[model samples]
Target: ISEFDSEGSNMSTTAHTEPSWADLPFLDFTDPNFSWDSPEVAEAREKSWIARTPLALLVLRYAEADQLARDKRLISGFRGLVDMVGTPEGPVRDFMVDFLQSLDGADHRRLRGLATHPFTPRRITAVQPFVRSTVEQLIDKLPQGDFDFVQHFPHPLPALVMCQLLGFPLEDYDTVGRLSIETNLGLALSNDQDILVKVEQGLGRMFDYLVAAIEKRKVEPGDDLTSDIVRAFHDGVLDDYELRTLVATVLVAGYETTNHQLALAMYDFAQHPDQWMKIKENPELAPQAVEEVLRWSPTLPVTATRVAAEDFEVNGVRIPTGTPVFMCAHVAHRDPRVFADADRFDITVKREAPSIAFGGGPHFCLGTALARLELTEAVAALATRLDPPQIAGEITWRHELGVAGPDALPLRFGAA
Candidate 1:
């Protein structure tokens, strides 16, 4: 049996005399002042590869994190977060319970297999036209003066692409965009009743909307992911609930995650005009710049908590059963041991090793190729169309959510 199925002893201190983390400093995610990207985080990682936090035990180094991510002992623990936070029993809760990232063992394999084909490298290439057209259209409409980059570009691009791929009506772009953002907030570690209620209501509306779209596709099949999934349902490969869950999963995974990451690239380019000008001069570097931006500022700095199924040792520290472990990509990606001149956000220099921005192992992001294409095209088109952006006003950020990126980015761009 895999480590996932093997039983382990209770949370007993008898296995080890003294905990290795007892003297370690805490990396508090709950603190408003404590950010994963802060310089102090790198300082703490220098002190040790592992640290204790109120919410979870973080593995700070790249090697250890890669090992733990592939280890069967540490299963996906998003469900554990739902339980600990006491999320209300509603559509949001139901969706989390069935979310692909929250499953393990055979069931995870089954669902993953069914959902994998549409996102393959070859399949992803088919969507290039849509991706390119959407990028050009957004850039073509850029206002001459100061404008919020988030509102005009990053905010709507991914959502529009998702609509095109899923066969959702283009008119419903606003609805899809709004509900997707609302439901994603549920992913955060929040127990506030207000947020929970909004999450549930938004998710319920999304389910209703998707179900209608699915029914329409059943009558008139189209060249889209939804149509392909609906055929499986018609063939008895999956039930209605399974069909709905899969659609929602793809939508949620593809939307805001890419949206925020694009926003982050803009934020980084704004700060590093020299790097930005380089891309404008050499559009081919867009792909290389995409990798660097992802490394420098990963929107999802921390992976979902992985619950330990059996006692395990990470970086010499014994973690007992039921302990929550989080892989900090925020720190790991910047490890000088892996990337030379790691802190410097220069895209021209090629790195020997790739960052764990999309994560590692079995649960690595399903949309990695698609997200990369989206970012690459956006960067290339913007560089060719306009000059480096000059900050028009103070940028705002969304810090409360699990993902990190700017809320508003006002910029003035000159004509190429």
Candidate 2:
């Protein structure tokens, strides 16, 4: 067996007579094999094991042929898990499991009926006006000096945008924002007991808030996503827990993931100023830049744990039934075979950029369109408004294993 350090450095462990998948740790983001910079490691994954992670039991590190096919299957599997009553360990994992359970013996027609309206392309485009207004508000409030972009910009952008989308009162933005941060901290800093306590408390408060919001929507429907969910509830299509799960999932997905993405984008831009310049000059590049950023610095580096329902052969390794697998989308995104010059940070490189940042297949991200819209609009607005935005101080990053983000991004820009 091979032991991986906390920083993803490699170390040899005493060889044990056990399956490779069986001996792996529950969560080891520090494994050298999974490092984004390891060229040899990427090649090895193409030839041998399709790197799976415990988090989602997903096969993320497979070669192009297997990766694309697996993506579709994974999506189906994820949808199945979402339709059932999930396990007691909370909604993240259980939501996916519930989706999977619903696949079996469920009516396809009814399933389609229950499926929340797809976030249409038109709907995504419609949010651009709101996104532009939100970005301007944040910039207008920024102090005219060196400021931490993470706190002043990226940290609050996602939550604020979500508030707009869900039609949640702007007054409650700070409350939900704080709760989202605590929940992320708890999940990311798993070893900290205090963080865990805060997470529990914060989640409790958030649940109460959601419950009240649901009730309020019931009494007074409004023109927002939450109201749409409430309408579904009134139709008797979803139960209480399902409603709660949907609301919670939207909140987490809306705020937490995109916040991390915004921070990660700044970190990437800081490292590669040339790319930043491109974005600054042509706002149209924002969409592609967002994709490159996601591929380069995936916010959720590790995937959720998944159990093999039956024996499977991937890349010559026979993974037996009931074996647990974990996949690292970050590692897969860096694979050379799929992406040309995979390690280099090239914002313009748009060839064969298959990113699992929002996941693939049945387990793909539900809020993907919204995230993309938010990121694109924010990046475009920032690029257009700031003249040569420069890094002003040391870029400090949050050391959370799952959600990789910059703790602080001090930036200074010339007058617009």
Candidate 3:
């Protein structure tokens, strides 16, 4: 159980060290010379040999380390801010600026305030009954024959839970869900002009919808979290821009990550039927199952990029200020020094230490509790309700390395 450096080591001294890949063919994102099965991509990632511009490399490095690279005092670079506007000072800074404006003044802070309680363990606990009920309701409605688990079960379950939490009408779930899927695709794709356009469109529509919801909540506050956020605005704890960022962050981070996790977890279970049986026989195994899934199939393989505020050192590697570094959770999780048979999918694998799925440090996912709760409840419901859930067809995965998962998981279950 050695704790390796999860943060990437600065390779400034060794930037030109030239790992073994010096002789291997290079990969160009523009041309993408390698196949999906090619070793070049994995080799570059594993050896950290890919050359990226300083800023872009820093972002990629931060993602790999699962560490936030924001400096609170600095207005120029902020964690979570970069992903929003593509760097505060960069060309697309206006996107975030406009996004903030859409929130207006009072409503922004309210959303951030409301988001706080829901992330707490106790609050997550409170939502368990609703989550379980939702799962059971979906299970009860399943047709007597086959259904796609990605579509009929795991996919809808998380969106439904999020809708309940946001107090958005269930009828609007499909709209938001579709937007979420598109958003995920848009973000995952390479920075093509068309993809960027679609990203802006999807995000713009999403923010507009959120702003409208905020307004509606202000007028007719409900018992859901949205109303709670509205109350926070009235109380004066948050501002307009903060509120929009919070809502947008949650919508982006919360839904997409969970959707990928659900699909990946199900795929894992399908691939490892023995582990699935263990979970089926003992629903209590859900937590361990979640951990194993998190460790084995971390949704975001690359840690979000973080910039070095000052010089830092890991091992003998000295990372100079502004030098970008990247760490792979896939590599770190599989580090032989950490877990025995790290590549194996074993629910019974004892986890005495925390996994890096939700990440580490202050910027760790705020929605982790809810994600876990959703996952535990969803898995338990599936195990208990379905006699035997088997994969129905070929599992196709999205090419986006940021979050990895099957696009569809057709499943056939025993009679309802």
Candidate 4:
């Protein structure tokens, strides 16, 4: 049994033995043994849902995952350490508690509302024109002969857009974007404190960079979203702690999924030539293709660890308070009863489920609309500007949890 059963331990009503972490297939994100709908994966998800693991009540069925997500009973407020230990203190921990993503109820609502000012779906395309121009420039730079599409094209698309949207110095876009990329990915994937501490050290440096921008925005606020938080801070709408937390998360929030998502979508696209060909033909089907991409290849196989705040029922199981709940979006995406030909990836089939890929409830991804637009633009740009891309060599994948994507998707513009 894991340490998760610690700290005023509680249990679900169902009788079950604690499965070894080895038996927990969902934890096997690093393993490439399973296909998207591998029967092995389905079995694991089923095993998890039925027996109820000690590693929090696992929500695997599509309807259960969906409801668990939006259920007000589930809260992210609990400390996230795996050992059932006290949350350590530091600027990092203070900033974390103040972070909007960790708050619940009215506090979460308030901070999230202020954070929402500039990221609304109405301004969804605020970054599209920029992404298109940059993608065009990047593709133009590619040699007519074989080149790495992932590096020259896909990687920079979202990185460039995120920095520009946050009002990064046009001249310093590359450096600032690099800082965000290295720190965000490092922190998210750290298996221990070494990588995390190094990334935390970078946080101070990045904060220095942002402090200058936030200071400037304080005096001369503008349409930039970074400036919005700065302005809110001045008006007493947000205290220093909240402001710093938002500052820390904004880059990761705005930049991360879009960047990784494009990579994943492209990898999946390469696998399904007919789908890529469909986009190549109509080009207008880019939006539809983007939805299919999200449905089929979401960046994370599961949602964040959300702890249940109070006793609740999930699919008839009595979930006690303090128990961690994880919603499996990957399972929901492939629910055969809900999705006809669910195991198969089909863009044209009107998806039966709304695709809980963006997450659910108040914690739903703030960048959802922006992610869609950029994906649509990225696919259309690839379709219209360059020839279909093919994997130039064996693909390399990330062997980590919380998110999934290719590491080195070495690809040729067309063929070798």
Candidate 5:
């Protein structure tokens, strides 16, 4: 029998046997040299559209990933998160269960409805001035010579905007930023117990912090999403857990990835100076640049694992009931069948189909508009206001896990 034959607790002997999936190449995420864009991944995709990980099936093709993404059988598979954290119940477990991405069906629909209004263009566009000024201030503060752009620009950009949008005091950026980083450890694909413990503690602290903020906003509301959520709670639209989850969603979803995405964009521009020059010459290309950048180097290389609720087959591979699937959007983005010259990163080419960067279906990113806005403004400001970005030193990246990007991007404007 295959390893997963016993996963569902039934003893159906004939229906289960050692299958062809057992022969699938395993995508070893722990390999230090591994990356979604590596030739190894391309070779694996050529050999088989699906690969195996310890806990899930890695969906590697664009067509399959896109189709499986919208399939109703593949529900969110983050419940193993509790096991990963070594805690059956706690703030971490509770938050993961209540996390918007973890919900399905009616609960998912309801909370998404309650949270959708605030993210509409009307509300997101209202933050244009804030996003613009914030980008300007960060770029203005860059040193005259080569500096670590990751530290100076991307690391702190999202925190500033998150504070503004979530009604947290500006002065609390440091605390908010620190805790958010700690909280994000929970999402890492690593299995180090030491790090997992920190993840648990971070979630506890973050929950307390968010709960306090939610209570404060209830009585002293402000012009922010937190206030809007609080107003909904007061009006009986959501419960206490729902309120905390919404705020936590904004906090958890808003930070980390966006920060890494900005750093990734800078790294992309630094490598593709021609693309950078294009944006510098015509700032209007910033939107396309943002899309292309996301397509090339999405911060979350793989979608969170989605579990199959029933038996299903894709591209001749049978995914048994309860099998968890992780869509490798990073690899899917490079599928030549869908994107012409798929390996090349060009901002000018208007593609036939969109990249699955923000994900798909009911669990699509709630912060899509805000993320695009942030990326557009940040990319435009960097390209238009500054000289062409060039790498000044070795780039340190966080490629050890599913969520990966440059940890330190030392950059110098123009030729040093």
Candidate 6:
């Protein structure tokens, strides 16, 4: 992926002292070639340490992002989202209030605990053997000639594994994958009310589809994640909306984010042959390299919206209650004070901080363990199969506010 280039961008919306981010179209944010790392983003930190978009206050520094994430006085930004759509009675809106990340206090803990069972370290680790085996198979199919490594390789595993985890149909992996991505990217920077409302209500068709799937699983359930949730629903532990959103959230976060994480990991290696060869020679280092991959370039440029529960002061700035803040992990992972040689990429060095690529606090990604396992094992297999991996063509990026990655990464692989 090319570094952040403002050449084609419509960065017309400047920052306070200069041109900062304004209400750039969602399409631009989601454009494949759209660049997120630019002077304005850097200036947001140098200036007031925040960038104001129509969406929320984009948190520029690592300390502030981490501080805000752990702040009890703050809450999930879902209410702010719902406030835009008003009250809509449907699976989409119905699930908004109690959505796992939206709630705080006891309610958040209860729902999180229920869904946390499947994602525990022990449970996710137990599946590693299978995940590695799957990766090996994918490695065998990896192209040695001109090919898009993404479509032929890393892109397929997460969807297949996630679908199996959720008890969704693996045959329709493409359908679920498309739905998860488009639905996931809808609220990147906050767009039109009609579009936002449409998204709030489950991105149109998927809401109803998930609702029906939940009911079907209730009748004759399989030993999958969705079936597990349906059984919980049967016990009256959750309502209709909770069930649907839980499945949707898991689908989007688990499937969509991990896909970008792995693809980005490959992008880093495809360029660095020395680093690639080191992992290729010593497969055990793959896991350690995976950590560096996450730290060097985290999947999300900025975190999901976090709202204020009450008035608070961040770096002497008084933020009123109920305000929304967007934290950029891209900055946090690279903060000089936190990580030694913060800007330099080092897969071997033991970084001091836990990469917030999966985010922090209770709202942290549940699939983190599983995601790490997949990447580490996949890289291990990749080292053995194709040194440096597929495609030598010019790489391209797909931009997104919520979760962004490669749009087209064509490659040509041959010889030894």
Report lDDT per candidate: 0.78, 0.61, 0.60, 0.66, 0.78, 0.68
lDDT (10s digit) by residue, model 4, range 1-416: 01322322343232232323234334333234635466766776656552244345556667767777888888883455322444345544554455666788897887788767556755765666776788778767777765555566656777677667777666675566566655543242234556556656766777877778877887877788778777778888888667766776767666656667787877777778777787788888887778778877888766655886786665446666676776767776777657787677777776646777788889888777777777888888887766666777766665544466665677766664
Backbone-clash count (model 1) = 0
Q: For residues 1-416, could you state the per-residue lDDT of candidate 2 as single tens digits?
A: 01112132111221122365453333334443444445545554554445433223334453532453343222233332222222225434444334322232343233334434535787777777877788889878986788888779887778777787777887677777876665442342233445445555666677778888888888999978778877888998777767766677667656867887887787777677777778878778988998988888988765443445565565455555444344566767776657888777788977665566875444456678888888888888777776556678897765554556676778876423
Ranking by lDDT: 1, 5, 6, 4, 2, 3
What is the lDDT, from 0 to 100, of the residue 138 in candidate 4? 72
Clashing pairs in 5: none
Model 3 Cα lDDT, one tens digit per residue, 247-347: 66666667767877887777777677777778888989999888888887877765433444466554234444544333345545654446677657888
TM-scores for every candidate against the unseen true structure: 0.92, 0.78, 0.76, 0.86, 0.90, 0.83
Reference-based lDDT, residue 176, model 3:
74
Q: Is candidate 4 or candidate 5 better by lDDT?
A: 5
Candidate 6 regions off by >4 Å?
A: 1-36, 39-54, 84-98, 184-204, 390-396, 413-416
Off by over 4 Å in 5: 1-23, 80-86, 187-196
Best by TM-score: 1
Clashes of each: 0, 33, 15, 0, 0, 13
Candidate 2, superposed: residue stretches over 4 Å from native: 1-35, 38-40, 43-118, 184-198, 303-305, 394-396, 414-416
**Candidate 1 ranges beyond 4 A from true positions:** 1-18, 187-189
Relative to the unseen true structure, what is the C-alpha lDDT of residue 253 in candidate 3, on a scale of 0 to 100? 66
What TM-score does structure 4 among the candidates reach?
A: 0.86
Tens-place lDDT per residue, model 6, 300-416, is 777646877786666655556655666777866666667788766777776667777776788887887888888888788877666575456777665445555775567644335
RMSD each, Å: 4.5, 5.9, 6.9, 4.1, 3.9, 5.6
